[PDB]
Amino acid sequence: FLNQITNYAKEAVQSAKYIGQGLSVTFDHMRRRPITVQYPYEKLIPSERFRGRIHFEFDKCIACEVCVRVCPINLPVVDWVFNKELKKKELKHYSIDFGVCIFCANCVEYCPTNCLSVTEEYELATYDRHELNYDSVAMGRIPYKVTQDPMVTPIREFAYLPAGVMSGHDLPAGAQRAGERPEAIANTA
Amino acid sequence: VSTELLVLGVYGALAGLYLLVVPAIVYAYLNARWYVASSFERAFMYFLVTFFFPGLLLLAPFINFRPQPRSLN
Amino acid sequence: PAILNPIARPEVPQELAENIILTSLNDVYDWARLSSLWPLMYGTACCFIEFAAMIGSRFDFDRFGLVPRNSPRQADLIITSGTITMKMAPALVRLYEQMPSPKYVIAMGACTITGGMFSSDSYSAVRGVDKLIPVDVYLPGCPPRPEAIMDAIVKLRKKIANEHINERGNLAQTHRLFTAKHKMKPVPPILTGQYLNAPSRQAP
Amino acid sequence: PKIETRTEPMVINMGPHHPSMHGVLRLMVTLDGEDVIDCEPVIGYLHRGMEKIAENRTNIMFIPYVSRWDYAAGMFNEAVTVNAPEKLAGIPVPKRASYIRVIMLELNRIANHLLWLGPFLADVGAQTPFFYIFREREYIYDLFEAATGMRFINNNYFRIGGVAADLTYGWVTKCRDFCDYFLPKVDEYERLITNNPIFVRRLQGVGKISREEAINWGLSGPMLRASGVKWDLRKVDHYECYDDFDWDVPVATEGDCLARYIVRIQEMRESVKIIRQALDGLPGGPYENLEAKRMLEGAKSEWNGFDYQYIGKKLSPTFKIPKGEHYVRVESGKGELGIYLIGDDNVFPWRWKIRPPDFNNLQVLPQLLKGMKVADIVAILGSIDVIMGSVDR
Amino acid sequence: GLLAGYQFVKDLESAGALALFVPPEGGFEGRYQRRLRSKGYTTLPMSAPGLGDLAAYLTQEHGIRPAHTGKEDIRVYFQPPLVTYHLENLPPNAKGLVLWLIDGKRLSKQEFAYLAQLTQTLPKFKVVVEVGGDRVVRWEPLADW
Amino acid sequence: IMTILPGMTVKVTNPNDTYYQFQGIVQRITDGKVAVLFEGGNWDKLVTFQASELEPVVVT
Amino acid sequence: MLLKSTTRHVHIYAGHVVDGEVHPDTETLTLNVDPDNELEWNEAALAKVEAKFRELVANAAGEDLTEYNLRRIGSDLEHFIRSLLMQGEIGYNLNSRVRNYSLGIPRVNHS
Amino acid sequence: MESGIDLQGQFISALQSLGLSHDLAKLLWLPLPMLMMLIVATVGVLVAVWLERKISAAVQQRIGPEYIGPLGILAPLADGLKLIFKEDVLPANSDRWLFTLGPAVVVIPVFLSYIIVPFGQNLLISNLAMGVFLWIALSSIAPIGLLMAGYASNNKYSLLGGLRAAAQSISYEIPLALAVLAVAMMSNGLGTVEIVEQQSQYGILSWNVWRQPIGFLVFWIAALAECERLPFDAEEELVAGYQTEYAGMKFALFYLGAYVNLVLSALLVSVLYFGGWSFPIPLETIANLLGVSETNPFLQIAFAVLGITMTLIKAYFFVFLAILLRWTVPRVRIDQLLDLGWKFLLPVGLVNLLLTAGLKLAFPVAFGG
Ligand code: SF4
Ligand code: SF4
Ligand code: SF4
C-alpha cells in the first residue's frame, strides 16, 4: 500500500515547485525601481491642504478669543489689555505652544479676520521642549518652502500626478495634477 | 631584472588593483547604472561589491555619494 | 532667590583634548553610534503607525542605519510613539531602564511632549514623557508625518555627534538610597491569570 | 538562574511591550504543555479618558479627538461623532456631502483592512507582503491628505452640516486610478492564503465561535459575518445613502480565522465597488466640473442647490446639543462603532458613551483560546482586528 | 575620512559669527561642536525658529506666557536673557559661550545681521548658525548676510 | 515702494509646480520670498513663493 | 511582583536593594532621588527631601501596599522636589546630556 | 620562486636567511594563514550583513542602509563598532560565567571550522584528513552554547528559547551528516582538497551536484536550519528568543556568529557539491591550449586568482540564495520545522545514502573509484 508514499513525494515536489515559483517571482521584485522617498534630499511636497505649523499675523488680529474657544484644548495664549484711549482690545504677545498643538487648524477656520493661516512646515523638532512655545514673532515667520531648497528634489505624492501616474519618481518635468481646472469648462461649454 | 622581483611586482600590481583601482571603478559603476540594471545585473554588481569588499572598505571614507546641489532655475 | 528654577554653576569641567588622535577616535565613536541607532520596536498608540510608515518602503527607515529591535537590550534608541498612560508609565520606565547606557529618547507626537490633547481633561495620561524619561529630541505634530520623524532622527544624529568620549560619566545613575520602614498592609495579587478557571464563570 | 522546572502549568506574560503591531495589552496565558488553558487579557494601557473629556468638549472641538479610537480608519470615528448631534437636532446633510462621506468611509474601510492585513500576514508567517501593503496604504494616505489635509487620522473633515471642504481638482481621477490599481491586489491577497495549503492549515478551525454564540457575545463586523450572520449596519440601518449602490454583504459559515480573512478580503472587494458606484453617481461629478458649472451658469440652475453643496449650513461653534438621547452607530472596519449621546441642551454632551467595535470582540478572545496551541494565539488575536485605542478609549 | 583639526575654532575666534553649511542627513557637523567644546567653550545648542525677536530673547527679559489648557490663567513667566544668564552662570576663566543654532533656514537676513553684530559687541559670545545645505561641512563668516 | 506690497491679490505663473493657476492673498514680505495666503478650501494655507514666479492680476 | 513607583526624580521600589537587584520586601521601601541627575542635590536639600520622604511614609501608615499609594507618595515627593527647585535651594545640572527643564524653565522671581 | 610559487617555502627560506631556526621559521609562518583566514571570515561577515540589508531592501522595493559610506558599505562596520561601545546588562540573577561563555561556546567552533575550507589547491590552513567530519563534529557544539545562553539568563522565554534553539539545532545535524556522507562516499575521503579534486577533473560535469541531485538539496536545507535562517528561525515564537538579554559585544558575538556560519555553510556547499575552486572548463586544458607550462609562476598566480574567484562566485551565489529564500519561503513554526528535520530530511538523506552506495557499487567509474 504505497498510496501515502507517492502522496508524500507529491506533497514534497509541490512544495518544491511552490518554493521555486516564489523564488522566481521574488527575483522579479529586485528589478523594480525603489519607491523610497529619500527624505533629506527628496523631501516630498505636502498637499495644498496639509495643516502644518500655524502662521500668525500680529496686525490682522482683532484680539477676540475665537481661536481659543474652537481649539480642542484652548491652547493659544492671547492676552490683551483694554486701552480706553482708543477703546479697542489691543492684543499683546499672542503665542501657541506647538508641543501641545494637535495641528487640526480649528483656529484657522474660525478666524473672523483670516489672521491665522496654516503652513506646509512640519520639521519642528527641538532639543528643548519649551522652545516649542512660538510667540507672535516666532510663528510670524515665513515657512520653509520645500520646492525652494537647493538640496531637495521635491516629489508630488499621489494626488498631484497626472491621470495615470502612481509614483512621483519618474516625473520628467513638472507635469501637473490631473488635468483641467474650472477656468477650462467655462471656455469649453 | 630578477624574476622574483617581477613576481613581487605583479603581486603589488594585483594588490593595487584589488584595493584601489577596480574598487574605484566599481564605485564609478554604482553611481552609474544601478536603477537601469536588471535583477541579474544587480546580482552581478552585488558580486562586485562582495569580491572587492576590502578595497571598497578602504575607499569608503573618501567617496562622497551625496546628491549634488540643485539649480532652482 | 531672584531666579525661580535656577541653573547651577559647574566645577569648571574641561577635558582639553589637545590630542588629534583621540579626537579622531572620538569622531569614529560618534559616527559609529550615530549611523547605527537601532530603535526599540515600541508602539502604544496612533503615532506608532506613522512610525511603521517609516519602516515601510515609501519612506525608508534603514537608510539612516536603524533597524528596529524586539528586545530593549539590543535597542540603541526609543521613539516613544504614543500616549503614555498611568498604567503604561512604569512599564515604559522599565523598558527604558533595560537598555544599555548610550541610549536616546525621542518624544514623538504631542502625547509625549506635553500629553497634547490629553493635557486638559484626562485623569490617566502622563503629560509628557519627560516626566518619566530624559528626552533628547522632541517631535511635534499630532500624527507627525514620517519626514518629520526622520527629521527628529537627523536632529538626534546632530545631538549624537557632539558627545565626548571622555564625558562618559553622565551615563551614570547616582544612587541616593534612603530606606524607610513603613506600616502599610500588604494586599494579595489581585490580577493572577485565572480568567476561565476562576470558580465564578461556571455557574451564577 | 532561578528558573526551576515544575509539572504544574506555567504562565506566559505577553505583556504591554509587544515587539510587533499588536497594541498595548497583556495576554497572560497559562498553556501547560501547549494547550492554552486560561487567558486573562489586561486592558487599559491606552485608557486616556475620552468619555470624560467629551463631557467638557464642544462637538466642533471634539472632532479632532475622534480619530484616536480606531486609529487606522479615523474618519469612521468622526462618522459617529458627527452623526450623534446630527440626529438629535435633525440637521439634514446634502447629497454630495453624503456621497463624499461614503467615499471617505469606504476608503477608510480599505485602509483599515490593509492595516489589519499587514500584521495578519506577518503573524501567520507570510511576511513578504508586509512591505507591499503599506504602499497602497500610502496611496490612501495621499488621497486623504489632499482632501482632509492630514493623513489617516487627524481629519476635521466631517461636520454636522456634512463635510468641511469639497474635494480637490484632481481627486476623483486619482481615486479611480487607485481603484484600477487596487482591484487585482485583493485577488493576489486572497490567492496568497487560500492557494497555499500551509496557511489554510494554520487558519482552519482556529477559533470556533458559533453563529448563536457570536450573537450572544456581542460580536460585530467581520467577526459576526464570518460566523454566518448577514448583519451589516449600512444595510440594516438605511445609513447615509448607502442604498443607492449595489453591493452584497460577505459572509462565511465556519467562523474561524480563514472565514474572517475571506470576509475581510471580500469586504475590500465590495468597498471598492461602492467607491466606483459613488464616484459615478457623485452629484455634480468632480469638484472642478461642478465649480465650473456653477461659475458659468450664473448663480442658479440647481448646481447652487442644497444637495449639490458640501456643507449643509456651516454652523457656529456654539452649537447646542439639544435635550434628548439616542444611540447612533456605523459599520466600521470592525463593525458596530456606536455612540450613546445624552446631551441636554448644553454646548457639551452630558454623557458620551463610546461603544467600541473591538472592545466587545476582545472579550471573546479567552473563549477563542480554549483548545488552541501557543503559536495560534497571535493568529486569533490577529483575526479579531483589535486596535487598542478603541478598546481603551 | 576628512581628519579635521582645530581650524574651526580659529575661524570662530576670527569671524565671531560663522554660518555653517551642513549636509542635511544628520550628524556630520557635531564633530566641530565637540572640537569647539574641547577647547574650553560652552556650546548652547538650541533651535532657532523657536526663538522670536532675538533682540528680546537673547539679551532682554521676555515673558514666555506658557500654555494654559483652559485651566490656568495667562501666567506670564519672565525668562532671563539667555546669552547673559548663560554667560554670568559660567566659570570666569572659560573661553566663552557659543550659541549653536541648528536651523539657520526659515530665518531672516535681519536676524543674521543682528546675530553677527551681537557676537561683535559683547566680548565672549559666538554663534554657529546652521543655514544648512552644502554637500560637505563648510562654513563662511556671517559678513554679507 | 513700487515693488510687491502685502495686501493685494496675486496668481502664480510657475508652470512646473503643484500650486499653479492659484489665486492668493499676499501676507508677508521678508527678504524677497513672498508668502501668499490661499483662501481655497476650508483651511487657509500659507505657501511661500518668490517674486520670480509671481505676477499680480488686474481683474480683481 | 515588585511594588514600585518609578517616575522621574524619584523611584520608590517597595523592597530593599542588595547588590544591583531590588528584592521585594513587604515592610520597607527604598527611595532613589534623581536617578538621572537633572538636579544638583547639595546635602542640605537632600536631607530635606529625605526628611520629607520619611514624614510622607509615616503619614501613609495603615493604607494598602498597592502601587496607587506608592504613586501618591512619589507624587507628593515630586511636588516637594519641584518646590525646592522653585525656591532656589536646588539648581539644574547643566552637565547632563539632555537639559530639557522637566520642572519648568528658569525664570526671574517677580518681573 | 622560479620552479613554482610557494609563499610558505619562500617565507621559511627568507626567514632562515636572517639566522633563525627551521622550526622557529615554521612557527613564525604559522599565524599568517590563520590571520588571513580570520580576515576572510571578517570580510565575509561584513559582506553577509551588507548583502542581507541590501538584497532585503531590493526585494521590498526600498533603498538599503544609505548615508553610511558611499553605498551602505560601512553599515555593518558601524553595527560592529556600536556593539563594542554598549555596556553590560546582566539580567538580574544571571550566571556571569555561563552568560559570557554562551556566545563564546556557540561561535568558537564555527570560526575553528575555517581550517576545512579551501580557496584553491593548498590555499587553505590545513588539509586535515578528517575534514568535513570534523566540521560536523565542531558544529555539534553549537547546542551547548545555545543551552548555556538559555539557562544563564534568569528569565524564562529565553530558557524556553534556548531549549527550542537546541532542539532545532540537533534536528538537522544528522541530515547534514548523511548529505556529507554521500560526498565522502563519492570522494573516498573527508579532506576538502580531495573532495574538490574529485570534481576538478572535467570542470563542470564532474561536480557533485549532478551526481547528488537530492543530496545537495538535503545539505542545503539542513545547513539553512543550522545557521538559524529562513523559516527555521512579526511577533516572536513566545515573547523572547534566547538572546533578548544580550546587549553589547555578546549580542555582537551572536550576530556575527550567525553570518559567519552562513558564509561557512555557503563555502561548504561550494566545496562539497560544486567545484571548490574549479572553473567549468578544466584548468589544465587551458594550460595546454595556451602552450605555457602549468608550473611557471604567472600561470600559477592567474590560476590561483581564478580559483579564488570561482570559490567566491559560488559562495556569493549561495549567500544570495539564502537572502532571497529568507523572503521567499513562509516562516514555519517549530513543529513543522522539526517534522522537516526528522520526518523528511532524515529519510531522504538515508535513501540518498543507500542509492549512492548502490550507484557506487554498480557504476564505480562515475561515482568515485
Ligand atoms: S480668532 Fe483670529 S482674530 Fe481672533 S484672536 Fe484668534 S487669531 Fe486673533
Ligand atoms: S491647530 Fe487645533 S490644537 Fe492647534 S491651536 Fe489651532 S485649534 Fe488648537
Ligand atoms: S499625539 Fe496624536 S496621533 Fe500621536 S498618540 Fe497622541 S493622539 Fe495619537
How far is it, in rounded angstroms, from Cα H148 to Cα H253?
A: 14
Contact A28 B39 (CB under 8 A): yes
Place of cell 593595487: B16
Asked if H178 and H308 touch (Cβ cutoff 8 Å), the reply is no
Look at residue H273 and give its three-state secondary structure. Answer: coil
> Which CATH number characterizes residue F34's domain?
2.30.30.140
Query: How far lies D124's CA from each of C20, D117, D128, in Å?
Result: 54, 10, 11
Note the maximum CA span of chain D. Answer: 85
Query: Interior CA angle at E99 toward E96 and E105, to 5°?
Result: 155
- Candidates C92, F42, C117; CA nearest to D61 is C117
How far is it, in rounded angstroms, from Cα D302 to Cα D283?
A: 11
How far is it, in rounded angstroms, from Cα D341 to Cα D354?
A: 9
Place of cell 496551541: D373
Residue H356's domain comprises 5-367
**Which chain D residues are within 8 Å of F43, Cβ to Cβ?**
149, 165
How far is it, in rounded angstroms, from Cα C159 to Cα A127?
A: 8
Element (H, E) at F11: strand F9-12
**A and E in touch (3+ CB pairs within 8 angstroms):** yes
Residue A26, in any domain of the structure: no
Look at residue F56 and give its three-state secondary structure. Answer: strand
How far is it, in rounded angstroms, from Cα H303 to Cα E16?
A: 63
Do A138 and A55 lie in one domain? The reply is yes
User: Is residue H156 classed exposed, middle or buried when 0-12, 13-18 and 19+ CB atoms within 10 A define those classes?
Assistant: middle
CA torsion through residues D317, D318, D321, D322, sign:
negative
Do A138 and A119 lie in one domain? The reply is yes
Do A65 and A107 lie in one domain? The reply is yes
Minimum-distance CB partner of C9 among E29, E35, E89: E89
> Domain D26-392, what fold?
Cytochrome-c3 Hydrogenase; chain B (1.10.645)
In this structure, how many other beta carbons lie within 10 angstroms of the beta carbon of residue C194? 16
Please give the DSSP secondary-structure letter assigned to residue H337.
H
Q: How was this structure determined?
A: cryo-EM
Look at residue H340 and give its three-state secondary structure. Answer: helix
Asked if D157 and D85 touch (Cβ cutoff 8 Å), the reply is no
How far is it, in rounded angstroms, from Cα E36 to Cα E100?
A: 11
How far is it, in rounded angstroms, from Cα G94 to Cα H286?
A: 73
Ligand 3 geometric centre to CA of A126 (Å): 18
- Candidates H213, H230, H322, H225; CA nearest to H274 is H213
CA dihedral D177→D180→D186→D187, nearest 10 degrees, is -160
In this structure, how many other beta carbons lie within 10 angstroms of the beta carbon of residue H280? 12
Residue B5's domain comprises 1-73
**Which chain G residues are within 8 Å of C183, Cβ to Cβ?**
27, 61-62
Query: Would the annotation count C142 as a binding residue?
Result: yes
Look at residue H330 and give its three-state secondary structure. Answer: coil
User: Is residue G47 classed exposed, middle or buried when 0-12, 13-18 and 19+ CB atoms within 10 A define those classes?
Assistant: exposed
Look at residue B64 and give its three-state secondary structure. Answer: coil
CA torsion through residues C110, C115, C120, C123, sign:
positive
How far is it, in rounded angstroms, from Cα A178 to Cα A163?
A: 5
Residue A61, in any domain of the structure: yes
List binding-site positions of A for [4Fe-4S] cluster.
Answer: 61, 64, 67, 71, 101, 104, 107, 111
CA distance H92 to chain G (A): 6
Ligand 3 geometric centre to CA of C112 (Å): 8
Ligand 1 geometric centre to CA of A113 (Å): 7
- Candidates D57, E22, H140, C151; CA nearest to A72 is D57
- Candidates C39, C29, C12; CA nearest to C156 is C39
Q: Which residues pair with F9 in a beta bridge?
A: F25
Residue A160's domain comprises 33-49+144-178
Q: Which residues pair with E46 in a beta bridge?
A: E101
How far is it, in rounded angstroms, from Cα E66 to Cα E78?
A: 10
Report the residue of chain A nearest C112, measured CA to CA.
Answer: A99
Query: Interior CA angle at E12 toward E7 and E13, to 5°?
Result: 100
Mutating to test ligand 1, I would choose from A59, A70, A78 the residue with most ligand atoms within 8 A of its C-beta, which is A78
Look at residue C3 and give its three-state secondary structure. Answer: strand
How far is it, in rounded angstroms, from Cα H62 to Cα H67?
A: 14
**Which chain B residues are within 8 Å of E1, Cβ to Cβ?**
60-62
H220: left (phi over 0), alpha (psi -120 to 50) or beta: alpha
Element (H, E) at D312: none
CA torsion through residues D103, D105, D110, D114, sign:
positive
Asked if D103 and D285 touch (Cβ cutoff 8 Å), the reply is no
Contact A126 E47 (CB under 8 A): yes
Residue A114, in any domain of the structure: yes
How far is it, in rounded angstroms, from Cα E29 to Cα E38?
A: 15
- Candidates D130, D79, D127, D129; CA nearest to D107 is D79
For chain F, the domain total comes to 1
Place of cell 548676510: E145
Order of strands, edge to edge, in the sheet holding D352-355? D326-330, D337-341, D352-355
The minimum-distance atom of ligand 1 relative to the CA of A70 is 1
Place of cell 470582540: D361
Look at residue E18 and give its three-state secondary structure. Answer: strand
List the grid coordinates of E92: 570666569
In this structure, how many other beta carbons lie within 10 angstroms of the beta carbon of residue A17? 10
In this structure, how many other beta carbons lie within 10 angstroms of the beta carbon of residue A43? 23
- Chains with ≥3 CB–CB distances under 8 Å to B: A, E, H
List the grid coordinates of H194: 580531495
How far is it, in rounded angstroms, from Cα H32 to Cα D96?
A: 80
Element (H, E) at F36: strand F33-38
Asked if C57 and A37 touch (Cβ cutoff 8 Å), the reply is no
Ordered alpha helix ranges (H), chain D: 50-54, 59-62, 74-81, 83-89, 95-124, 130-147, 171-194, 197-203, 211-216, 222-225, 233-236, 257-280, 287-296, 365-368, 377-383, 388-392
How far is it, in rounded angstroms, from Cα D340 to Cα D351?
A: 7
Residue F6's domain comprises 1-60
How far is it, in rounded angstroms, from Cα H227 to Cα H167?
A: 14
| Helical pair C21-34 and H75-85, crossing angle rounded to 10 deg | 110
Look at residue D40 and give its three-state secondary structure. Answer: strand
Counting Cα atoms < 13 Å in the Cβ hemisphere of G72 gives 12
Look at residue F12 and give its three-state secondary structure. Answer: strand
For chain B, the domain total comes to 1
CA torsion through residues H322, H324, H330, H331, sign:
positive
Contact A114 F16 (CB under 8 A): no
Q: How far out from the chain centre does Cα H368 lie?
A: 25
Look at residue G43 and give its three-state secondary structure. Answer: helix
How far is it, in rounded angstroms, from Cα C80 to Cα C43?
A: 7
3-state secondary structure chain A: CCHHHHHHHHHHHHHHHHHHHHHHHCCCCCCCCCCCCCCCCCCECCCCCCCCCEECCCCCCCCCCHHHHCCCCCCCEEEECCECCCCECCEEEEEEECCCCCCCCHHHHCCCCCCCEEECCCCCCECCHHHHEEECCCCCCCCCCHHHCCCCCCECCCCCCCCCCCCCCCCCCCCCCCCCCCCCHHHHC
Resolution in A: 3.0
- CB of A168 closer than 6 A to ligand 2? no
- CB of A99 closer than 6 A to ligand 2? no
What DSSP letter does each residue of D338-389 carry, written as one string?
A: EEEE---SBSS-S-EEEE-TTTTTSSSHHHHTSS--STTHHHHHHHTT--HH
What DSSP letter does each residue of H138-160 carry, written as one string?
A: HHTTHHHHHHHHHHSSSSTTTHH
Asked if C10 and E86 touch (Cβ cutoff 8 Å), the reply is no
- Candidates D344, D340, D347, D313; CA nearest to D60 is D347
- Candidates D184, D335, D141, D170; CA nearest to D272 is D184
Query: How far lies D133's CA from each of A47, C53, H60, in Å?
Result: 22, 11, 11
What DSSP letter does each residue of D44-98 carry, written as one string?
A: -TT---HHHHHTTS-HHHHTTTTTSSSTTSHHHHHHHHTHHHHHHHTPPPPHHHH
Which amino acid residue places its CA nearest to atom 4 of ligand 1?
A64
In one-letter notation, the amino acid at residue A166 is M
**Neighbouring residues of D156: CB distance < 8 A, sequence distance ≥ 6:** A104, A105, A106, A109, D63, D64, D148, D149, D164
Do A56 and A95 lie in one domain? The reply is yes
